[PDB]
């Protein structure tokens, strides 16, 4: 019956969910719990590099607020 | 860590393709009133693995007349390109965020054809030549309108970036504004993946097998692996461009899962069509496209240049 | 990729059947005929039986005639399913083949139930038939027939109006009426291009002159027209099967001349003369009076004929088989002028050629 | 147990892979081709056992020689058999191929395909029924199962 | 030409649609209130820096502070 | 009696509704959608396949399969060297070499059937006047080696012993027709 | 560096699969197996001889149309202009000229394959 | 990375050298595909993007049509590769070594000049607008729709006339 088709489709669905979820999780993990800052313009690149120098750890995701 | 992300993006995609093969066989069987693979492992799950092991354990032919360099290079290029094209796709966060992602997709897809062309020419066999020069016409057909269709749809997106389409479709599918284009794009994907009703480069009935006639074993298996990965890829591109999933910055998992659902739907529709329709002739395909889609496609591109102006709805840049 | 010349090379499946037959009695040659057109078996052996009956100057019994017409129609359905579905499979469409081969299997079940073999029955024998229909076979035939129409209509809803199919067939393999007649075409290769000819109507055999059935004729003369013609022929075959089922008569099944057809086993076991007849029939065989004839039937493909020459022995002197498709595959070149390789692949299907018959 | 146990299970795996996906070749010569079609038909779906037809001899596994093999056709049959890639098998189906069959005493018939190519399974009949052919294919699968190439290599 | 147009509509619908859409693509931009606003919006978008200009004491319209009433106002864009 | 299968009849009928219907047909792919619907309808129907190894399909009593030689209830080979079976076998697969017995009886000492030459036609089982040679229900006797398909009197008689029940049933249920 | 890394990884994966496919299987090479394929019979002629292309005209026309595609692909950034009227007029002229060229070729039978 | 751009340019030179040696048109097309890819990469590394991708696209299309033409007209019973002809092979190696030696010679005679292998990669990019936004080459190219409409007019006319010219040459 058509139900017997659906095991393979379920395997597919899992195998195609993993890419996106894994990418999001790993991007968040490796960018300080925040999604990767996209640099689609020199302005964004400059902002990221300023954060990199300001943080003092050479990391753009590490954020210094009013305290600094 | 980036390597771990690469693994998570490759291995699942390859497995999904492996089981696309099984799903195709079972769906076709059921639609044709038979059951399909269901004896090799529970419910036939192990059929793709058995097939891959057999193909990679069979002797790879090296026919005397062939040109070894190209005859070996082409399958590698096919699989490499099909896998690479999965790189920039947002789901919702692309592994690689490219500003001109759409042009990158077009470049990679276009270079894909050279796998078929070179393999066919290198086989040094008459059926190989037939297949290669049919693929040439297939490209001459789809490539003219694919670029225009993408231009027209992106004329509501404002930039070639894929990720921008996530926001574009925040409150609505792009299908509704451009359903006329969605259909032409769907047929163009059907042609590009070289699948029925447009599987004329490997049509068993006319050419014993096309470009891949002289290929055997693992070198052969690479071609089919790339073919099915490309099916999944193109339907993913359709799902992202049209039929936009639900994106909320709070949960990317929703986007991922909804995208999976829609991509499976379209991939199933590919096999649905394969089992439902005959095969175009390789001049009828070119006639179809050039004399039906292109006249309409140019008009639609004109109209979608006009729309942002006379509706004062220019897409934002950035 | 345009076909500038077609040179059909055949003989790759020629096994000298015409010479082999000359060495075997008239009963011992019948199985060959079931293999000349392995797709439509009972019609070939019907041609043989009619020829041998003509020479013997004997007449089949009424029940045998009706049974032969019924199973001839079933065989015509089998042939048309094979032609249409293989043609579609080669053109591209694949599902109708699987859909229809289930019904082919059911018809094979009928074949086996009556004759003990799913094909190559050897059921039709000069004189009538080997055995009478096992009880219930008419009921099963009714159950199958009442439903086959819906399955053919599904295949039609798939193929008839599809633009892809119409583009892939229409105005392909166009053959003019005069050219076809000159080339020697037959059957649908003739009726497709407007020629009003069908031996079952013009020169009836068996009981084809008591059952009403129309003869589809095409106007354009192309592959699409001939595909429609074959489908309509299947429908008319269903019509004829209905009439045969309703008018199946009672009585014997094989000519009651024990010097031609074997006597029943009980008679063999309790009658001296009957035992002698059994012995000589299954050793020496009948002695067909000297003569010559050319019997023709409207086989599911075309005009299957046998030119049989007998010199009074129990073995034929010469048995030329006129296969319907010989002239067709001869006219392939004329049909394929100015067509691509794909069009040619389409053209070969319309001919509906079985190289068993082509090679003989 | 021992490393040779690893070898034994490894060729078990090889045999499983080869037997569970033997792609035949489209090579219907005569009547018996119709019965092979009926094999593929829904009722006895050969696909269910992993069996799928592929036209390319370079991409086929088993050759199902089905029908009369005439002298004219013999060179082509041998050519394609030679062209098939190595781990290849040959199943003869029908009397025409098993032996001469109805045309044994004929000038233009190869009295059996064993003369031209080595035969691994014979399927009797005329035609052999599709159920019989499926049973024969399963028997070929058993033959593959009992292989032991790698164990032979180790004990070499 | 009613007859030829009616026939074309059925026997070559693709070209009828294409020519009609092209004709509309030309006609509509001229016939539409909103067309003027596209160039105004693209001029409103401030990609570069607004360079201050030295106040010679006789510049009466340009403001001194961004929040002063004088100067261009994007109320029209806000409620387009 | 003939019926046109594809003759175009009345042509002048052009209408606005007809034209928009035709344009919709061409542009929207109506007939293609309909074919797709048919395929799905089949998708949702019970398959017609059968798990063959544990579910053989039907076969009638007339089915012709592997040969066998029957015995009388006393246990005696019915084969009386008729020789008609050998005379009638169209493919000439039967070979009989018979000699008188020590009991003053007619029997066969070499009964060979070449099952790579037989055409499974039933002429032997119908020309046997004592119902010795029969074609039993078995249809699965594929062998790996050719020489195992050249049968002999022994193998035939053991097949008869093995299948005597089913052969008996088929003959019982069919003899009235024969 | 990420794009280079991932593309090289894809290349290496494909090449590794090929090498495994060529060094794992047991082989037997002989002339009849190696000789080319042509439906079971020997090649009547080599496949390197000229093969007429019946769509040469459309093939060339593809070149020019693809360059038109190139000329049009800047439109997404063009629309971010201030001279919207000029951009509209120019794009309309370009596409209309494209359409006229295609229409002339069609009416002149350019797209009909050459026999 | 220091040698990134120089390596890409050298690969471009080698691909162009192969094309100049002129093997069979199939290998010529393959070589030009590789050269077009490398050139696109050089443009990308020089801050470009749209231009590199456009060259790659148009060149893929062009070589597709060219290959189709070669299989039909520019063909031989035994196509000659780079290695097949011993003269081609020898001059391929000679050209490679000659370019290497010429690089060394120019570096030695002019320590800083056309080539500065020492200090290589120190002058790839000169200036960048750090805090800009609209600096993408697509903008410059799209300028043809506003400030350089004459360019568009001439190019569009060229393609239009190309249609008629090609049809009448192939008549
Ligand atoms: C790309 C490079 C193009 C620019 C010129 C290259 C100069 C160096 C080439 C060295 C000589 C290679 C040769 O002789 O050709 C032999 C081969 C033809 O060999 P063959 O077909 O005659 O078979 C050889 C058989 N044996 C082994 C028995 C001798 O052609 C090539 O090498 C070109 C292959 C392409 C290499 C580039 C891969 C890029 C990836 C795809 C994009
Ligand atoms: C995820 C699915 C895709 C996976 C693709 C990769 C497939 C991986 C398969 C794993 C099994 C690995 C063993 C494969 C052996 C296949 C070739 C073979 O059987 O050779 C036997 C050979 C046979 O040994 P032999 O050489 O002595 O046999 C006799 C040789 N002749 C005929 C010449 C006399 O044994 C080996 O040496 C193979 C070593 C394999 C390690
Ligand atoms: C068997 C043979 C196999 C051959 C495989 C060949 C695969 C080729 C795949 C098709 C590539 C064609 C398109 C050109 C390369 C990609 C161009 C691109 O997308 O942009 C590259 C990107 C620079 O631009 P971007 O980052 O998007 O925007 C700037 C702000 N971030 O960032 C970059 O600069 C990265 C540039 C490198 C791109 C990949 C190079 C792969 C080289 C493989 C050898
Ligand atoms: C408000 C102001 C603005 C108004 C603007 C109005 C715009 C209206 C636009 C309406 C037109 C919609 C676009 C339709 C594109 C189809 C083009 C066409 O007309 O059909 C061509 C062809 C039919 O074949 P043929 O008969 O030869 O047509 C030419 C006859 N001389 O058709 C074909 O190619 C069919 C052959 C290929 C079949 C492929 C199989 C597809 C199976 C069905 C897919 C259905 C789902 C597609 C959607 C996917 C979405 C992801
Ligand atoms: S064995 Fe019998 S059924 Fe099979 S091809 Fe030969 S004659 Fe036909
Ligand atoms: S098989 Fe029958 S006819 Fe033949 S010898 Fe035996 S008993 Fe007599
Ligand atoms: S079934 Fe026919 S061919 Fe076979 S042994 Fe009996 S008589 Fe001979």
PDB file of C-alpha atoms in Angstrom, chain C residues 95-171:
ATOM      1  CA  UNK C  95       2.900   3.397 -17.300  1.00  0.00           C
ATOM      2  CA  UNK C  96       0.318   2.040 -19.807  1.00  0.00           C
ATOM      3  CA  UNK C  97       2.544  -0.967 -20.450  1.00  0.00           C
ATOM      4  CA  UNK C  98       2.436  -2.014 -16.804  1.00  0.00           C
ATOM      5  CA  UNK C  99      -1.249  -1.139 -16.574  1.00  0.00           C
ATOM      6  CA  UNK C 100      -2.228  -3.336 -19.506  1.00  0.00           C
ATOM      7  CA  UNK C 101       0.086  -6.272 -18.951  1.00  0.00           C
ATOM      8  CA  UNK C 102      -2.050  -7.218 -15.965  1.00  0.00           C
ATOM      9  CA  UNK C 103      -4.939  -7.786 -18.362  1.00  0.00           C
ATOM     10  CA  UNK C 104      -2.587  -9.589 -20.728  1.00  0.00           C
ATOM     11  CA  UNK C 105      -1.800 -11.893 -17.819  1.00  0.00           C
ATOM     12  CA  UNK C 106      -5.504 -12.483 -17.189  1.00  0.00           C
ATOM     13  CA  UNK C 107      -6.029 -13.372 -20.840  1.00  0.00           C
ATOM     14  CA  UNK C 108      -3.040 -15.692 -20.525  1.00  0.00           C
ATOM     15  CA  UNK C 109      -4.827 -17.287 -17.592  1.00  0.00           C
ATOM     16  CA  UNK C 110      -7.775 -17.987 -19.893  1.00  0.00           C
ATOM     17  CA  UNK C 111      -5.374 -19.359 -22.492  1.00  0.00           C
ATOM     18  CA  UNK C 112      -3.879 -21.727 -19.953  1.00  0.00           C
ATOM     19  CA  UNK C 113      -7.217 -22.779 -18.471  1.00  0.00           C
ATOM     20  CA  UNK C 114      -8.443 -23.847 -21.891  1.00  0.00           C
ATOM     21  CA  UNK C 115      -5.258 -25.253 -23.431  1.00  0.00           C
ATOM     22  CA  UNK C 116      -2.848 -25.906 -20.569  1.00  0.00           C
ATOM     23  CA  UNK C 117      -0.272 -23.406 -21.858  1.00  0.00           C
ATOM     24  CA  UNK C 118      -0.136 -19.671 -21.279  1.00  0.00           C
ATOM     25  CA  UNK C 119       0.955 -19.164 -24.875  1.00  0.00           C
ATOM     26  CA  UNK C 120       1.759 -21.478 -27.761  1.00  0.00           C
ATOM     27  CA  UNK C 121      -1.391 -23.359 -26.857  1.00  0.00           C
ATOM     28  CA  UNK C 122      -1.672 -25.489 -29.993  1.00  0.00           C
ATOM     29  CA  UNK C 123      -5.356 -25.449 -29.084  1.00  0.00           C
ATOM     30  CA  UNK C 124      -6.698 -24.897 -32.601  1.00  0.00           C
ATOM     31  CA  UNK C 125      -6.155 -28.062 -34.607  1.00  0.00           C
ATOM     32  CA  UNK C 126      -7.145 -28.851 -38.204  1.00  0.00           C
ATOM     33  CA  UNK C 127     -10.621 -30.182 -37.531  1.00  0.00           C
ATOM     34  CA  UNK C 128     -11.683 -27.819 -34.772  1.00  0.00           C
ATOM     35  CA  UNK C 129     -10.106 -27.683 -31.319  1.00  0.00           C
ATOM     36  CA  UNK C 130      -8.290 -30.101 -29.072  1.00  0.00           C
ATOM     37  CA  UNK C 131     -10.639 -29.963 -26.076  1.00  0.00           C
ATOM     38  CA  UNK C 132     -13.878 -28.336 -25.007  1.00  0.00           C
ATOM     39  CA  UNK C 133     -13.994 -25.239 -22.847  1.00  0.00           C
ATOM     40  CA  UNK C 134     -13.671 -26.131 -19.148  1.00  0.00           C
ATOM     41  CA  UNK C 135     -16.812 -25.222 -17.255  1.00  0.00           C
ATOM     42  CA  UNK C 136     -16.866 -21.636 -16.001  1.00  0.00           C
ATOM     43  CA  UNK C 137     -14.474 -20.241 -18.592  1.00  0.00           C
ATOM     44  CA  UNK C 138     -17.309 -18.332 -20.238  1.00  0.00           C
ATOM     45  CA  UNK C 139     -18.174 -16.811 -16.863  1.00  0.00           C
ATOM     46  CA  UNK C 140     -14.589 -15.690 -16.291  1.00  0.00           C
ATOM     47  CA  UNK C 141     -14.406 -14.276 -19.815  1.00  0.00           C
ATOM     48  CA  UNK C 142     -17.556 -12.291 -19.092  1.00  0.00           C
ATOM     49  CA  UNK C 143     -16.094 -10.937 -15.857  1.00  0.00           C
ATOM     50  CA  UNK C 144     -12.923  -9.864 -17.638  1.00  0.00           C
ATOM     51  CA  UNK C 145     -14.676  -8.361 -20.650  1.00  0.00           C
ATOM     52  CA  UNK C 146     -17.211  -6.299 -18.716  1.00  0.00           C
ATOM     53  CA  UNK C 147     -14.310  -4.424 -17.107  1.00  0.00           C
ATOM     54  CA  UNK C 148     -11.664  -4.281 -19.836  1.00  0.00           C
ATOM     55  CA  UNK C 149     -13.407  -1.268 -21.357  1.00  0.00           C
ATOM     56  CA  UNK C 150     -12.631   0.939 -18.364  1.00  0.00           C
ATOM     57  CA  UNK C 151      -8.948  -0.007 -18.457  1.00  0.00           C
ATOM     58  CA  UNK C 152      -8.640   0.794 -22.151  1.00  0.00           C
ATOM     59  CA  UNK C 153     -10.439   4.079 -21.474  1.00  0.00           C
ATOM     60  CA  UNK C 154      -7.869   4.888 -18.793  1.00  0.00           C
ATOM     61  CA  UNK C 155      -5.052   4.229 -21.250  1.00  0.00           C
ATOM     62  CA  UNK C 156      -6.850   6.530 -23.663  1.00  0.00           C
ATOM     63  CA  UNK C 157      -7.287   9.269 -21.073  1.00  0.00           C
ATOM     64  CA  UNK C 158      -3.519   8.991 -20.761  1.00  0.00           C
ATOM     65  CA  UNK C 159      -2.467   9.012 -24.424  1.00  0.00           C
ATOM     66  CA  UNK C 160      -5.254  10.100 -26.781  1.00  0.00           C
ATOM     67  CA  UNK C 161      -5.227  13.886 -26.462  1.00  0.00           C
ATOM     68  CA  UNK C 162      -1.874  14.451 -24.770  1.00  0.00           C
ATOM     69  CA  UNK C 163      -0.128  17.171 -26.739  1.00  0.00           C
ATOM     70  CA  UNK C 164       3.195  15.375 -26.367  1.00  0.00           C
ATOM     71  CA  UNK C 165       1.828  12.155 -27.848  1.00  0.00           C
ATOM     72  CA  UNK C 166       0.018  13.998 -30.623  1.00  0.00           C
ATOM     73  CA  UNK C 167       3.176  15.899 -31.548  1.00  0.00           C
ATOM     74  CA  UNK C 168       5.251  12.729 -31.344  1.00  0.00           C
ATOM     75  CA  UNK C 169       3.015  10.731 -33.713  1.00  0.00           C
ATOM     76  CA  UNK C 170       0.809  12.957 -35.880  1.00  0.00           C
ATOM     77  CA  UNK C 171       2.000  13.400 -39.469  1.00  0.00           C
TER      78      UNK C 171
END
